[PDB]
Coordinates of C-alpha atoms and ligand atoms in Angstrom, one line a residue:
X16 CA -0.8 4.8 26.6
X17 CA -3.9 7.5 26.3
X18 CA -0.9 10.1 28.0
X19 CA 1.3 9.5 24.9
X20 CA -0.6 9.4 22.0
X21 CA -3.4 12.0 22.5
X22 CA -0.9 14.6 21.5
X23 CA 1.3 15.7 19.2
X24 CA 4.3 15.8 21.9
X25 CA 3.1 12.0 22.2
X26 CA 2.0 10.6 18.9
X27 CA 4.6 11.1 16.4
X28 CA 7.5 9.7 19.3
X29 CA 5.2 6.5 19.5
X30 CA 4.9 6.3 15.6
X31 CA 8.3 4.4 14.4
X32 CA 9.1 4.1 11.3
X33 CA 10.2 0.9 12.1
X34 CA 6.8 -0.5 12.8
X35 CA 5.8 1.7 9.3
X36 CA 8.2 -0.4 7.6
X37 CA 7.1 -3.7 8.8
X38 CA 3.8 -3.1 7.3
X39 CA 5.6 -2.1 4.0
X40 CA 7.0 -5.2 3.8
X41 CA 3.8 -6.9 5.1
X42 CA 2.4 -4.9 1.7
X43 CA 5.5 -6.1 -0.7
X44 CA 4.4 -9.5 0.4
X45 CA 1.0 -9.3 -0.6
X46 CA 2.0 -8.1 -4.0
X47 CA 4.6 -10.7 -4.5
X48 CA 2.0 -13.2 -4.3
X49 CA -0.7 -11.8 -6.2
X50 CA 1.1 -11.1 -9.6
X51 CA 3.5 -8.3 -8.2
X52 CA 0.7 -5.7 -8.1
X53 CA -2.0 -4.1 -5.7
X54 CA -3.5 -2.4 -8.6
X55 CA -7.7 -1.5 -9.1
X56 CA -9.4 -4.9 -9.5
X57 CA -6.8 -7.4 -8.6
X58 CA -6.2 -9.8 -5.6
X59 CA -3.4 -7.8 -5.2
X60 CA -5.3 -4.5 -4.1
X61 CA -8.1 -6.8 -2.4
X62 CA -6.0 -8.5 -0.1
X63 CA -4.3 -4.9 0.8
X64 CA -7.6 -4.3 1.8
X65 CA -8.2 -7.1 3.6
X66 CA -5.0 -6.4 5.6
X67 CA -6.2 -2.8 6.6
X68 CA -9.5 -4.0 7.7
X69 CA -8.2 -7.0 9.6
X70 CA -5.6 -4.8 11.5
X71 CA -8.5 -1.5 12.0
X72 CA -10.8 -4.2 13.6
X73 CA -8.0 -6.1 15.7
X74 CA -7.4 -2.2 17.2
X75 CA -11.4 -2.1 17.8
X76 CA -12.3 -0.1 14.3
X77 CA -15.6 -0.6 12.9
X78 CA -14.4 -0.6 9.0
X79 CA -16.4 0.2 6.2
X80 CA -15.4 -0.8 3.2
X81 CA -17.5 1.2 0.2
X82 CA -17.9 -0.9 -3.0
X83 CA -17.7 1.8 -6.4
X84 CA -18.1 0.4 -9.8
X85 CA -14.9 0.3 -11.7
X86 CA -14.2 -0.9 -15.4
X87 CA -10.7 -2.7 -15.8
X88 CA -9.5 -2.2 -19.6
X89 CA -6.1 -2.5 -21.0
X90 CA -4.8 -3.5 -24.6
X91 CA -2.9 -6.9 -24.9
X92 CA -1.4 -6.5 -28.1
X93 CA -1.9 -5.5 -31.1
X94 CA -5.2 -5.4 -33.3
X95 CA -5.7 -6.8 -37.3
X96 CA -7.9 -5.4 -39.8
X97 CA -7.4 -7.0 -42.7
X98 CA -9.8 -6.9 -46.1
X99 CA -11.0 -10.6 -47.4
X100 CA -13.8 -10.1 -49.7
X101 CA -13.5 -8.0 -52.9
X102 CA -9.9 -8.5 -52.8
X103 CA -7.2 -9.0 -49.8
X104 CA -5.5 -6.0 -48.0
X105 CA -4.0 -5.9 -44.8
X106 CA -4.1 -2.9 -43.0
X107 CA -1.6 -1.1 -40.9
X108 CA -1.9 -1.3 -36.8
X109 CA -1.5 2.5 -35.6
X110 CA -1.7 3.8 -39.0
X111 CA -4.8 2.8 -40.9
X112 CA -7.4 1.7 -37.6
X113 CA -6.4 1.7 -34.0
X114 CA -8.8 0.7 -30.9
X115 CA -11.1 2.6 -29.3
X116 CA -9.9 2.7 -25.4
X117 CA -12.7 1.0 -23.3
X118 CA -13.6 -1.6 -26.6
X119 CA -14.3 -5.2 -25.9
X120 CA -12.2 -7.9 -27.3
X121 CA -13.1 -9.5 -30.1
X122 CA -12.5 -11.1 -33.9
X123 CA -15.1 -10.6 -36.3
X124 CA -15.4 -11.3 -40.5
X125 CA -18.2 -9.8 -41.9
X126 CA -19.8 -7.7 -44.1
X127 CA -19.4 -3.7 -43.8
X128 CA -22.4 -1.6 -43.6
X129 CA -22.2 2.3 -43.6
X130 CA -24.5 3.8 -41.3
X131 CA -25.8 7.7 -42.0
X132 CA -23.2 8.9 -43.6
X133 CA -22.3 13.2 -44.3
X134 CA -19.4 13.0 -46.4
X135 CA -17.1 16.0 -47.6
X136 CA -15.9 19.5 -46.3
X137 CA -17.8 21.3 -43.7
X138 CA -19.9 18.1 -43.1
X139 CA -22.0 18.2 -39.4
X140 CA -22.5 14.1 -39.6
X141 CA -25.0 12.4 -36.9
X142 CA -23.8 9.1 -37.8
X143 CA -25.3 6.4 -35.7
X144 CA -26.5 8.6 -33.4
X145 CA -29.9 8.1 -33.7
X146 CA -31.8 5.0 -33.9
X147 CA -33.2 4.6 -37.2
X148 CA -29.4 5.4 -38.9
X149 CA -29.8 1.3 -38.3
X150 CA -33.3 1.4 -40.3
X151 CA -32.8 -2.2 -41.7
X152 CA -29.3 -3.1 -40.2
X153 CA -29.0 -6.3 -41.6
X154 CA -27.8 -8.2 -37.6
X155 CA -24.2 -9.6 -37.9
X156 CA -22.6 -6.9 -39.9
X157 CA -19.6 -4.8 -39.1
X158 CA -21.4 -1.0 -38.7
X159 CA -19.3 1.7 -40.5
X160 CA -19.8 4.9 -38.3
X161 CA -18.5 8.1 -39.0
X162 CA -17.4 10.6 -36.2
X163 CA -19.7 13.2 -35.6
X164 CA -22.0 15.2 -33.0
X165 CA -22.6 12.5 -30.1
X166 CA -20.2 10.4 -28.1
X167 CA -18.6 7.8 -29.9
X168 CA -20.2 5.5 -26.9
X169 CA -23.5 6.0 -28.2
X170 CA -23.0 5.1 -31.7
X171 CA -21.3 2.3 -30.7
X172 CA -24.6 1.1 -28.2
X173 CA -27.0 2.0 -31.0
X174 CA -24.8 -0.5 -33.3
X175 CA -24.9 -3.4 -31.0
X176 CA -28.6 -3.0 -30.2
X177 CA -29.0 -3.0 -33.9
X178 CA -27.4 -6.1 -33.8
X179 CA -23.9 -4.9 -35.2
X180 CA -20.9 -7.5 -34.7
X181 CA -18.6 -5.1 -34.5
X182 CA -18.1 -1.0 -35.2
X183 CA -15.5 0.7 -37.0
X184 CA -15.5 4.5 -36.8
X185 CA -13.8 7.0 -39.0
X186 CA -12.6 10.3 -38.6
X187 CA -15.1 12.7 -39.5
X188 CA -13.0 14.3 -42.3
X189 CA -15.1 18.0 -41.8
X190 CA -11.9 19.6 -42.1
X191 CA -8.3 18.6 -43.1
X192 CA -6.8 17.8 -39.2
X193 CA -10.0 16.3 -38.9
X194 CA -8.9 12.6 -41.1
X195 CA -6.2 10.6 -39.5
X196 CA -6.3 8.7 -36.3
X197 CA -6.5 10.1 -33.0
X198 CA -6.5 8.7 -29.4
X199 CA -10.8 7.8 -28.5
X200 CA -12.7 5.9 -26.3
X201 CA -16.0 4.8 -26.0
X202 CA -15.8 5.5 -22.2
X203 CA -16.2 3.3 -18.8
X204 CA -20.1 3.3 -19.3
X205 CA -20.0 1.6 -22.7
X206 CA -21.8 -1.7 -22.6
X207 CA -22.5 -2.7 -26.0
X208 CA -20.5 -5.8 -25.8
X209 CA -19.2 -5.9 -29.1
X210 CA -15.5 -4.3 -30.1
X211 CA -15.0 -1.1 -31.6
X212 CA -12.1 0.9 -33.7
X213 CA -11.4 3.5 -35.0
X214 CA -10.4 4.6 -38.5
X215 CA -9.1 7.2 -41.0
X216 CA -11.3 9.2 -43.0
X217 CA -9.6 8.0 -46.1
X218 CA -10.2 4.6 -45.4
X219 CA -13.6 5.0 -44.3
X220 CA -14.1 6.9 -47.7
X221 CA -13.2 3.8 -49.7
X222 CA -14.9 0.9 -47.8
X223 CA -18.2 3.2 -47.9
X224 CA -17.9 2.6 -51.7
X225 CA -16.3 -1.0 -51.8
X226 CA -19.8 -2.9 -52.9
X227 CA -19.6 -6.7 -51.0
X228 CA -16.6 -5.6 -48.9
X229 CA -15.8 -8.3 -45.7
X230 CA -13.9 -7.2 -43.4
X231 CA -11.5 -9.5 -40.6
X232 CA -11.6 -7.4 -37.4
X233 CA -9.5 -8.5 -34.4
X234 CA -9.3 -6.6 -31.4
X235 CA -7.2 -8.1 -28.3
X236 CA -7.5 -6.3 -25.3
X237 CA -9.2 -7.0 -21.8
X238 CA -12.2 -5.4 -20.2
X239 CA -14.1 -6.5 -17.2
X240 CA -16.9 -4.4 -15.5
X241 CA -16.4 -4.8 -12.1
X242 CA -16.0 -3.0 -8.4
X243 CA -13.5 -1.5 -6.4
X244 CA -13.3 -0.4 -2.8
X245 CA -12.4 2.2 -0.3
X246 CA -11.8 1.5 3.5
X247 CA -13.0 3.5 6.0
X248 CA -12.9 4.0 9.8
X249 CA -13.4 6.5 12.6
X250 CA -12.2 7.0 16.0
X251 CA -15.4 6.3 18.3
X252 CA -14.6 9.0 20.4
X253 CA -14.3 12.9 19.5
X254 CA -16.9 15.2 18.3
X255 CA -18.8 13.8 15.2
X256 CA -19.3 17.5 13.8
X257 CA -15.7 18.6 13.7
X258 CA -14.3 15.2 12.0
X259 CA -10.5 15.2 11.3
X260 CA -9.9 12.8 7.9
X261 CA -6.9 11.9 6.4
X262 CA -6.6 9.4 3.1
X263 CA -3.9 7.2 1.6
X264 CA -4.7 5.4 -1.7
X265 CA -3.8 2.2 -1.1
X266 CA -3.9 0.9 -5.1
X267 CA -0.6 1.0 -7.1
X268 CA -0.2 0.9 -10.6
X269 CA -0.5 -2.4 -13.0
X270 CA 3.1 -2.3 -13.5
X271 CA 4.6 -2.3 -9.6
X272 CA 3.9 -3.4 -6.2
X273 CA 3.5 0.3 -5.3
X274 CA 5.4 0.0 -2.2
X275 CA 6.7 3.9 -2.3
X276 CA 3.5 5.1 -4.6
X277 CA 1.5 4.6 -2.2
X278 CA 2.5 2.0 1.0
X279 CA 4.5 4.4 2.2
X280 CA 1.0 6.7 3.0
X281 CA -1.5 3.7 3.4
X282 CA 1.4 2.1 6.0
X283 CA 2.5 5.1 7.9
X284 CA -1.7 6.3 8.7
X285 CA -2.4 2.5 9.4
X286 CA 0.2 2.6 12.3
X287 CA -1.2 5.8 13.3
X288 CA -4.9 4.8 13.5
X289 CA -3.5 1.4 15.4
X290 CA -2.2 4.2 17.9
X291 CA -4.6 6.7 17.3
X292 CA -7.5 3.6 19.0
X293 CA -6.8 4.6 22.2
X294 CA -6.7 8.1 22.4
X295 CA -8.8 10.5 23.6
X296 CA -9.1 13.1 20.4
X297 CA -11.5 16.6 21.3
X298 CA -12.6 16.2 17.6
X299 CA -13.4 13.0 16.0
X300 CA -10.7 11.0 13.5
X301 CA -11.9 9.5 10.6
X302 CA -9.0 7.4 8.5
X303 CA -9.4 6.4 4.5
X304 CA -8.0 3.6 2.3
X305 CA -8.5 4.9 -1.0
X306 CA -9.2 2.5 -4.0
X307 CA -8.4 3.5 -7.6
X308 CA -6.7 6.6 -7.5
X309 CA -4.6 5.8 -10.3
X310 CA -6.9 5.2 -12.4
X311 CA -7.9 8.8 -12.0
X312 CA -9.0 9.3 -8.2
X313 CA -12.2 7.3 -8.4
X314 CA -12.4 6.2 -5.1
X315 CA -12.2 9.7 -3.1
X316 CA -13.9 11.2 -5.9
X317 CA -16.7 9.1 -5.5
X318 CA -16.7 8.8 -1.7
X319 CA -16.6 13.0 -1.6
X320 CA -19.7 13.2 -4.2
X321 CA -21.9 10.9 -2.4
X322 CA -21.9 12.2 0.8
X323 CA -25.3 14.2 2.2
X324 CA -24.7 18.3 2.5
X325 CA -25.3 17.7 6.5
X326 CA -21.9 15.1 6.3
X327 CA -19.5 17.0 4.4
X328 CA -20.5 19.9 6.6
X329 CA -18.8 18.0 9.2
X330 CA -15.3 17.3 7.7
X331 CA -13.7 19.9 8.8
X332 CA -10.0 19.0 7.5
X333 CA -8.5 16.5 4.8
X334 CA -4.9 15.7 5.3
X335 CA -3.3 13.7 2.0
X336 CA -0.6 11.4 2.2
X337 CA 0.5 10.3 -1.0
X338 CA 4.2 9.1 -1.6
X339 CA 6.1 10.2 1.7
X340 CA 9.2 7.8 1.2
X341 CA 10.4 8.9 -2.0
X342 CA 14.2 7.4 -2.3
X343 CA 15.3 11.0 -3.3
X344 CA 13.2 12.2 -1.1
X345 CA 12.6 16.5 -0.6
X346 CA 10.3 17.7 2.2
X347 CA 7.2 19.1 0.0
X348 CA 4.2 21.0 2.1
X349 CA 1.2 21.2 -0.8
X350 CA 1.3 24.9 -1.0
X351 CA -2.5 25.4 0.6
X352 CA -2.1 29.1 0.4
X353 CA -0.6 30.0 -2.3
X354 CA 2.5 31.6 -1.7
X355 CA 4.6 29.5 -4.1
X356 CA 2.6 28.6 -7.0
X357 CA -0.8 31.1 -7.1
X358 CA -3.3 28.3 -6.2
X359 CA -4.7 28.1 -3.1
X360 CA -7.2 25.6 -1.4
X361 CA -10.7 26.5 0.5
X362 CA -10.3 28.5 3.8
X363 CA -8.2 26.4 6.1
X364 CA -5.5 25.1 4.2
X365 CA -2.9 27.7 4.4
X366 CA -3.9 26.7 8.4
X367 CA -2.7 23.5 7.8
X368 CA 0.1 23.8 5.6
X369 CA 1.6 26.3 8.8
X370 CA 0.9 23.7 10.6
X371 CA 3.0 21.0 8.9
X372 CA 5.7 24.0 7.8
X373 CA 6.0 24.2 12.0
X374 CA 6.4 20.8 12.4
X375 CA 9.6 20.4 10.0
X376 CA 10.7 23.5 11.3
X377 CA 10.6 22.7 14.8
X378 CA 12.3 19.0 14.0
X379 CA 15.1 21.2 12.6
X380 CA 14.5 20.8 9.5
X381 CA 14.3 22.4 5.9
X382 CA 10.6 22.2 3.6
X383 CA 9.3 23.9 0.9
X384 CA 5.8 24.0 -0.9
X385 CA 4.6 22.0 -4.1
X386 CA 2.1 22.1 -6.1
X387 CA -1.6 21.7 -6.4
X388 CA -1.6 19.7 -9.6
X389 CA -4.7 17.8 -8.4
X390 CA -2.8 14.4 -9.0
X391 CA -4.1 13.0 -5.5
X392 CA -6.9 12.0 -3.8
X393 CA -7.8 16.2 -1.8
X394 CA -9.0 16.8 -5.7
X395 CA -12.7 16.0 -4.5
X396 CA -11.9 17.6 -1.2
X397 CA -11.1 20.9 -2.8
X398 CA -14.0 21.2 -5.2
X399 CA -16.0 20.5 -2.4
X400 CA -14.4 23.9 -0.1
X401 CA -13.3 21.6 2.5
X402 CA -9.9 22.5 3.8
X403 CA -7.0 20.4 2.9
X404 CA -3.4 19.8 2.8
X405 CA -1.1 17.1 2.6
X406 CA 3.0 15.8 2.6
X407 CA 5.0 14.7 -0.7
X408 CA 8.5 13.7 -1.2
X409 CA 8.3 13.8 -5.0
X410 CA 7.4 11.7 -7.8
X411 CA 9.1 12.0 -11.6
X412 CA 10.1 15.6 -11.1
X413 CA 14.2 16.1 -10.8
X414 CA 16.1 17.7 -7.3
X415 CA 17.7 20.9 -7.6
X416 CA 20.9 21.2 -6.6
X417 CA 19.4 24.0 -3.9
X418 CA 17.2 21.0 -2.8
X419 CA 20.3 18.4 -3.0
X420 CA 21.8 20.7 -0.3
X421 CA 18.6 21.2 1.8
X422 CA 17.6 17.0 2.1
X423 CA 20.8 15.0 0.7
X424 CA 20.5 12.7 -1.8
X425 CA 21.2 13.7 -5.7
X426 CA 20.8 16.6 -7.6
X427 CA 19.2 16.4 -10.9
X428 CA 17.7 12.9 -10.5
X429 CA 14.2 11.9 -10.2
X430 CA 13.0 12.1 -6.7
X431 CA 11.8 8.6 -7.0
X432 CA 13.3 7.2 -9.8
X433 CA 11.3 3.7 -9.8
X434 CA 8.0 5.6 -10.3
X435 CA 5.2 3.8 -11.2
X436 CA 7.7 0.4 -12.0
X437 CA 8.5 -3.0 -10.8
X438 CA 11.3 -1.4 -8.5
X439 CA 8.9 1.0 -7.0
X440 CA 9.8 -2.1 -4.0
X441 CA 10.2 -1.9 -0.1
X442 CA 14.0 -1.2 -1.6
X443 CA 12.5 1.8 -2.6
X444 CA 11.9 3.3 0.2
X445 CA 14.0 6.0 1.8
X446 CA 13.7 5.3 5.9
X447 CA 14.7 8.9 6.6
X448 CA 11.6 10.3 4.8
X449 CA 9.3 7.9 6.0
X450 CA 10.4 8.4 9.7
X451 CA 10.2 12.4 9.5
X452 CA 6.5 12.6 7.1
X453 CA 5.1 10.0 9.6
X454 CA 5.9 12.1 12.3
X455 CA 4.8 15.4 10.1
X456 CA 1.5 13.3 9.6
X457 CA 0.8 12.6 13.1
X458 CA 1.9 15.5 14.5
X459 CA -0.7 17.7 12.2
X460 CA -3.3 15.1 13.2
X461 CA -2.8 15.2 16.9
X462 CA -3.1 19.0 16.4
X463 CA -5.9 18.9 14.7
X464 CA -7.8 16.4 17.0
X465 CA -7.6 18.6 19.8
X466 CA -8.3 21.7 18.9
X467 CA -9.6 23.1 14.9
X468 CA -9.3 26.9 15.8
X469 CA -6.6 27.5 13.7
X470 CA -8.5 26.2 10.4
X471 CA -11.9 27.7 12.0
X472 CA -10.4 31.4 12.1
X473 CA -9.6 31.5 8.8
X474 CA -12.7 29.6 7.7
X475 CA -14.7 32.9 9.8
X476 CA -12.3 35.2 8.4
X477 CA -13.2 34.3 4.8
X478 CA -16.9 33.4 5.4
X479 CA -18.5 36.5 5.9
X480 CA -21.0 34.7 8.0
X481 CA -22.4 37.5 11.3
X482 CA -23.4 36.3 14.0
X483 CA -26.4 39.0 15.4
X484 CA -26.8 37.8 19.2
Ligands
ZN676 ZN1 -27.9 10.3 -37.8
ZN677 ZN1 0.1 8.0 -5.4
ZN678 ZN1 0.7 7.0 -8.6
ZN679 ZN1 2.8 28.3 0.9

């Protein structure tokens, strides 16, 4: 009924956690039959976004759903490096080599060729980083590649267009911390195909001078470059140049169905854009899906920094909802002014965080702020000055016994204890949290979709911007 749910006295009474629930489950289901994950590039995550689409559409949504490029890479086990030409040596996993994060798989014998090196104390090596450092290159060799001056990505690119079968880089030994092995990558953009690790300077020292050395290279991870996605839809009613957003990632980790982290906010702003279709919102409401955010907030990020000046002019709020069924569950308001932690967001959000600090206060009930560690998807949002604020019922952090007694549960255990695990299950979820952040969630949006003037005064306030006539 448009009476209802075009106000926050109506919305978050017709928002039941019961329904939020069903569409956890609905979620768990998915994941148990794709592998037991929703994660970035999986069936998992695609048919979760087939489900959101499906249901946005059935409530009369146009969806978009925005493609982003997104490399999958993890290590399957462990790699080899092993000496088979002057004389055998087997080398130590983790002590002598170690991948380069974002290498292709691969096993490789060949012979070693040093590329450019600058040995020695003090040494400002370009190894490899310019083309004719492969002057010669004889194609199929291993290219030995000292660190130094450009990204390790682009020695390894100007090996494999050189025709290099594989790359081992070394430490670049310029100073005495500078010479054992250290945690690298060759970044999401690397496409040279071929697999990559990296060394200590020591050992790079000694194959450098081992004349006719063959080296056995094995490398045993996964890497696909592929896409990922982010959903998108808006209310067709409300004004276009006052839009109200909210976001929920809707990926979990590789390890979990991601049922608390993040179902719990994908589900709970699914119900409430299923109500939310036929309402009559003042100011437009525009609801995201958001792909890959743990695989550092690609999704929003992307979807933030591709958006025309004129369009992000027109967001006028982001409301986060990231983990809001914790099973130890506090009440945490991200502290959009300030007052708790010294970092506040653009103009608006200490509007919005009142807002939500009203809303558990008029329930009755107890909240306190939390911090902006940028761990969620308002990070673009807040580098961008748009005014934000979200709900959180805690991740790996520990309850205080002052919170114990403000929202039950345990003192001095994690607020949700299956974090980023295989438990992190529709079990997982606390039904008391759920029920009160959904209401939190639709109550501020309600709010917000009639009437902005609490974020706009503040937004005047700080903008300095005089009006002459
Ligand atoms: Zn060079
Ligand atoms: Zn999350
Ligand atoms: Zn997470
Ligand atoms: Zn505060």
């Amino acid at each position: 009924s448009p009476l209802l749910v075009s106000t926050p006295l109506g919305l978050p009474r017709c928002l039941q956690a019961s329904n939020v629930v069903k569409r956890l489950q609905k979620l768990e289901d998915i994941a148990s039959l794709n592998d037991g994950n929703r994660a970035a590039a999986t069936p998992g995550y695609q048919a979760s976004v087939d489900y959101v689409k499906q249901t946005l559409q059935k409530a009369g949504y146009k969806v978009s759903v925005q493609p982003f490029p997104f490399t999958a890479y993890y290590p399957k086990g462990p790699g080899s490096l092993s000496a088979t030409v002057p004389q055998p040596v087997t080398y130590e996993w983790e002590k002598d080599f170690t991948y380069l994060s974002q290498t292709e798989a691969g096993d490789v014998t060949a012979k070693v060729v040093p590329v450019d090196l600058s040995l020695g104390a003090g040494n400002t090596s370009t190894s490899g980083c310019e083309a004719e450092d492969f002057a010669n290159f004889p194609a199929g060799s291993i290219a030995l590649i000292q660190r130094g001056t450009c990204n390790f990505e682009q020695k390894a690119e100007n090996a494999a267009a050189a025709g290099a079968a594989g790359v081992i880089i070394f430490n670049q030994g310029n100073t005495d911390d500078r010479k054992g092995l250290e945690n690298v990558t060759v970044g999401e953009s690397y496409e040279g195909g071929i697999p990559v690790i990296f060394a200590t300077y020591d050992n790079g020292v000694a194959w450098s001078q081992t004349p006719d050395l063959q080296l056995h290279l094995v490398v045993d991870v996964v890497r696909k470059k592929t896409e990922t996605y982010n959903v998108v839809a808006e209310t067709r009613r409300g004004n276009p140049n006052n839009v109200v957003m909210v976001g929920a990632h809707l990926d979990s980790v590789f390890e979990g169905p991601g049922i608390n982290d993040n179902g719990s906010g994908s589900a709970a702003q699914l119900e409430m854009a299923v109500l939310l279709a036929k309402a009559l919102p003042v100011n437009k409401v525009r609801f995201a899906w958001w792909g890959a955010e743990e695989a550092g907030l690609v999704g929003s990020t992307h979807y933030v920094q591709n958006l025309a000046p004129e369009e992000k002019k027109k967001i006028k709020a982001y409301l986060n909802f990231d983990m809001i069924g914790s099973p130890n569950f506090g009440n945490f308001i991200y502290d959009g002014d300030g007052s708790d932690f010294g970092l506040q967001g653009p103009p608006g959000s200490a509007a919005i965080e009142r807002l939500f600090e009203a809303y558990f206060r008029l329930r009755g009930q107890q909240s306190e702020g939390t911090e902006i560690d940028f761990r969620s998807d308002y990070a673009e949002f807040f580098n961008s000055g748009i005014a934000f604020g979200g709900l959180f019922t805690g991740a790996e952090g520990l309850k205080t016994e002052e919170q114990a007694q403000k929202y039950g549960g345990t003192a001095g255990k994690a607020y949700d204890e299956c974090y980023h695990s295989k438990c992190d299950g529709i079990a997982n979820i606390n039904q008391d949290a759920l029920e009160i952040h959904s209401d939190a969630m639709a109550f501020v949006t309600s709010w917000l979709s009639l009437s902005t003037k609490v974020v706009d005064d503040e937004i005047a306030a700080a903008g300095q911007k005089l009006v002459p006539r």
